[PDB]
Amino acid sequence: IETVPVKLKPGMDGPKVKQWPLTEEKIKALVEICTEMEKEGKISKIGPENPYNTPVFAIKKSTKWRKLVDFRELNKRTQDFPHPAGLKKKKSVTVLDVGDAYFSVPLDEDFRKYTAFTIPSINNETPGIRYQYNVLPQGWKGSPAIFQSSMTKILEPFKKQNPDIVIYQYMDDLYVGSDLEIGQHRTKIEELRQHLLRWELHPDKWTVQPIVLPEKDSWTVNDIQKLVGKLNWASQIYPGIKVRQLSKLLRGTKALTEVIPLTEEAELELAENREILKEPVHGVYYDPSKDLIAEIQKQGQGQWTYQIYQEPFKNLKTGKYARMRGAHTNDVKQLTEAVQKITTESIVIWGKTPKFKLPIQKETWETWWTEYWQATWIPEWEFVNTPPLVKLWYQ
């Protein structure tokens, strides 16, 4: 009910960021929505004395258009304001959208000028409509940090009632972990929702994927060459990998399709390598100070692979993604959904989003990613233009 003073970092000016072009329907939706928000005092029009601008577009979570603000620049420019590690160990986790509460808290008068945004016009026929936020905006990192106390006071009775449930909060989203059954889980979620009114993920079903080698009765030259390549790659990750006895088989010049019988030394070496690969990775730790890096590779046929790490050849997590919903004919949609899922998992495990390395040209991604994006937050990303040789090694 009272505004807590908010400032910026030591010497960082407020965000000035170009608004990117929007289609006509999205502009309409934003006009209607922002009119309704203007009527409710949530935002207010501003003049030219405000230099600052933050990007804004429109999505669909539901056929109702939602307003999304790209608060990345503002978040990194906003001054710096207890991760429940038992959240990733829970049987099930459900995510809720508690953003609707953020608009009940007034914002510090001095900081509003930094939350300025522009609804753009087609063909620049008229000046864009500029607004500023009067309340806590969704997408800002300061909003959950400010509403944290209120959220605590609201969620106190539910937490004291049954402490088998973990509750975490990230941005506009509220994560709830439990060990119950899906039906009882949904009734519990209904009771929690109506508990918030008065005021489906499975973390246990993910793992860290091992490196597997083929089991064959007969090996071709090509098979063994791929095997030696893969093991040579794995040598960077594991200490005791050796390939000299397998390479010993490849000696001489032979056709790729010719079958080469394994020796006893080769089979022994291969087995030793298997035993080595069955072990976890040596000395893999998480550093809360460093940055999380997510790499994604396109495997084709809806298949995508990914690795989250901090130092090269030291994976904090690895996973696959073959989920198909209406995405069959579109690569970019697939990549967008994949990036979203990976970011969510990262939020659950470490309480923060990673930096992505997308196997896509900058122009394509920049053009189309906002069409398929259903998430209230946004991560950081970069683009890898050189094809990785290691693709099939993660396949």
Partner 1 sequence: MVPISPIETVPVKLKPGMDGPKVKQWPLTEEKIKALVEICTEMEKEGKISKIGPENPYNTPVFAIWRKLVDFRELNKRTQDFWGIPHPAGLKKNKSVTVLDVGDAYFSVPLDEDFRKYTAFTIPSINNETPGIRYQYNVLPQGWKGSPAIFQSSMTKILEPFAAQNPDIVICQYMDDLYVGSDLEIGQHRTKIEELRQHLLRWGLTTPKEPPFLWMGYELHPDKWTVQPIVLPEKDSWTVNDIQKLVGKLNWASQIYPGIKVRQLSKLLRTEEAELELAENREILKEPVHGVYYDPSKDLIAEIQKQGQGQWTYQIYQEPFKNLKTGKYARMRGAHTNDVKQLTEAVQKITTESIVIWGKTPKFKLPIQKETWETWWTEYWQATWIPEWEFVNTPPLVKLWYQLEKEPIVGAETFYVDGAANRETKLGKAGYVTNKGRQKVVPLTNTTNQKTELQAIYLALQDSGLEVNIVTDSQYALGIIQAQPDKSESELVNQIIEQLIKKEKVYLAWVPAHKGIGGNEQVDKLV
User: Interface residues with partner 1 (CB under 8 A)?
Assistant: 21-24, 27, 47-51, 53, 122-127, 130, 220-222, 225, 228-229, 232, 243-244, 247-248, 250-258, 297-298, 300, 330-335, 358-361, 363-365, 367-368, 386-389, 391
Q: Which two tokens stand for residue 53?
A: 């601008």
Helix (H, G, I), strand (E, B) or coil at 314: strand
Q: Of the two residues 126 and 289, which places its CB atom closer to partner 1 in the complex?
A: 126
CB of 290 to partner 1, least distance (A): 27
- Measure the CA–CA gap between 356 and 362, rounded to whole angstroms: 13
Shortest CB 84 distance to partner 1, Å: 34
**Minimal distance, residue 215 CB to partner 1, in Å:** 19
**Cβ closest to partner 1, residue 37 vs residue 227:** 227
Residue type for position 381: W
**Phi-psi category of residue 111: left, alpha or beta, with phi > 0 → left and psi -120 to 50 → alpha:** alpha
- The least CB distance from residue 231 to partner 1, in Å, is 9
Q: Could you identify the residue written with the tokens 């420019």?
A: 77
Work out whether the CA dihedral 34, 36, 39, 42 comes out positive or negative. Answer: negative
**Shortest Cβ 92–partner 1 spacing (Å):** 31
Give whichever of 150 and 245 is closer to partner 1, judged by the CB atom: 245
Cα maximum dimension of the chain: 81
CA pair distance 15, 112, nearest whole angstrom: 12
Least distance from partner 1 to the Cβ atom of residue 12, Å: 13
Instruction: Indicate the DSSP class of residue 7.
Output: -
Q: Which is nearer to partner 1, 80 or 363 (CB)?
A: 363
Q: Which CB atom, from 205 or from 325, has the smaller least distance to partner 1?
A: 325
Helix (H) or strand (E) holding 310: strand 303-311
Q: Would you say 172 is a known binding-site residue?
A: yes
Taking the complex as a whole, how short is the minimal distance between the CB of residue 39 and partner 1, in angstroms?
15
Nearer to partner 1, 150 or 232 (CB): 232
Is there a binding annotation on residue 108? no
Provide, rounded to whole angstroms, the least separation between the CB of residue 361 and partner 1.
Answer: 7
- Alpha-carbon span 7 to 188, nearest angstrom: 39
* Token pair listed for 34: 């922002």
Beta bridge partners of 178: 92
Which CB sits closer to partner 1, 69 or 192?
69
Task: Say how many C-beta atoms besides its own lie within 10 A of residue 61's C-beta.
Answer: 12
Q: What dihedral do alpha carbons 23, 28, 33, 34 form, nearest 10°? A: 90
Which amino acid, 89? K
**Residue 131 φ then ψ, to 5°:** -125, 165
Distance CA 30, CA 66 (A): 8
Residue 21: exposure state from Cβ atoms within 10 A (0-12, 13-18, ≥19): exposed
Tokens 């000035």, residue located: 16
With respect to partner 1, which residue has the nearer C-beta, 85 or 122? 122
Extract the annotated binding site.
97, 172-173
Residue numbers belonging to the annotated binding site for Mg(2+): 97, 172-173
